[PDB]
Amino acid sequence: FASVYAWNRKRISNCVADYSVLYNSASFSTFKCYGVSPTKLNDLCFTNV
């Protein structure tokens, strides 16, 4: 992973993303979602990430 002052930026567009497996992963110590609930991620979606 790149350094903090040169944080790596990635564009996600035109693909399907399964957020359920990402949320259910226990390897993440901190997981904070603010805009929308993590459960309802797979229902509504925007144009890019």
Add this chain to the structure above:
Amino acid sequence: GGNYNYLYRLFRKSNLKPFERDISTEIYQAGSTPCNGVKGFNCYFPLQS
């Protein structure tokens, strides 16, 4: 000093019927793994001050 006597609900399994009352302070399982009455990951106290 801050009033902590006022507690409001944030998490619930479903919605509330009109003129309904809920007082059960049960642990909420926010993930696939059941909490089994134990506070932890994907587990939150439904009441907040």
